[PDB]
Design a protein around this ligand. Sequence first.
Ligand SMILES: COc1cc2ncnc(N3CCC[C@@H](c4ccccc4)C3)c2cc1OCCc1ccc2ccccc2n1
Ligand SMILES: [Mg+2]
Ligand SMILES: [Zn+2]
Length: 305
Amino acid sequence: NLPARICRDIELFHFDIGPFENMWPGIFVYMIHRSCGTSCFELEKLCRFIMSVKKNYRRVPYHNWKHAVTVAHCMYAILQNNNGLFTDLERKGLLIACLCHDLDHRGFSNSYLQKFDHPLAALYSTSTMEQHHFSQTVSILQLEGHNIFSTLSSSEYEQVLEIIRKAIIATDLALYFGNRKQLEEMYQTGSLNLHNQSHRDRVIGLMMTACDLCSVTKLWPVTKLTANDIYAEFWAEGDEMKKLGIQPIPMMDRDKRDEVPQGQLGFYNAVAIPCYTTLTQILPPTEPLLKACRDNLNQWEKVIR
Ligand SMILES: COc1cc2ncnc(N3CCC[C@@H](c4ccccc4)C3)c2cc1OCCc1ccc2ccccc2n1
Ligand SMILES: [Mg+2]
Ligand SMILES: [Zn+2]
């Protein structure tokens, strides 16, 4: 069962899941049963599914099993503070999408895969690794005793898989810029309609981005340490770009590491702040994410001074 401190702290947007890996499944089970009912998901099947998902994450610095559960927690907190907006089915799908969205991630971007001429880039031209993460999710669901959705109708099964596919694909940050621009225009013209499936899919897309980027919404000591893991992958990809004979972008070039604070500023300005600002406009109870993001922007500004 869940320790008292976790029981309380799990409801905070800036919760950190801790360094004990064997506790994470229980944290995920608690979140999905609190969000979607103890009804649905036979415990045994869910646990089996969870353990296989874990097994298919890699021991990379950032896009690892810990990241999956952390992204799932952020989604939990959004859903807990916006009661009555999403269906039981959506809530289950979104939480599973979050757990699975980075399956088999090797710590390299779609861009590197393209430049490498990796076989995945020939299979899936755009959102290469995300299409792969979704395929891996379906493959795991298809394993004996792993169908956590087995009690759903055929129609609901197809429904939930589609929710998951769109949610995983939306974690391709390249898609975020256009998604956010459209949502913002709809907000400002007052035409956003959550009963319109296309608008709804967009809002879910932004939620997925907001959860994926959530390191910037933790408290500063957590944000700062997490940035170390983020750069560890970027710099490893930059080394690999150099090995292909391509000069990496500055963000991936360890020779430019002294410019991290300026790079962070750019990221918060162009990506993080607009993302959480748009999210708060649509879902006001997500305000704490924006506040924490702004606090971290200030800390980065403080580093530069
Ligand atoms: C939480 O941190 C980051 C988290 C990120 N999470 C996901 N993707 C990122 N990249 C993807 C490619 C585009 C990039 C981007 C887009 C617009 C504006 C800036 C960056 C975001 C992230 C960049 C981050 O920060 C990296 C920031 C950065 C940018 C340039 C740099 C240049 C030199 C040194 C460090 C640098 N660091
Ligand atoms: Mg990803
Ligand atoms: Zn991710």
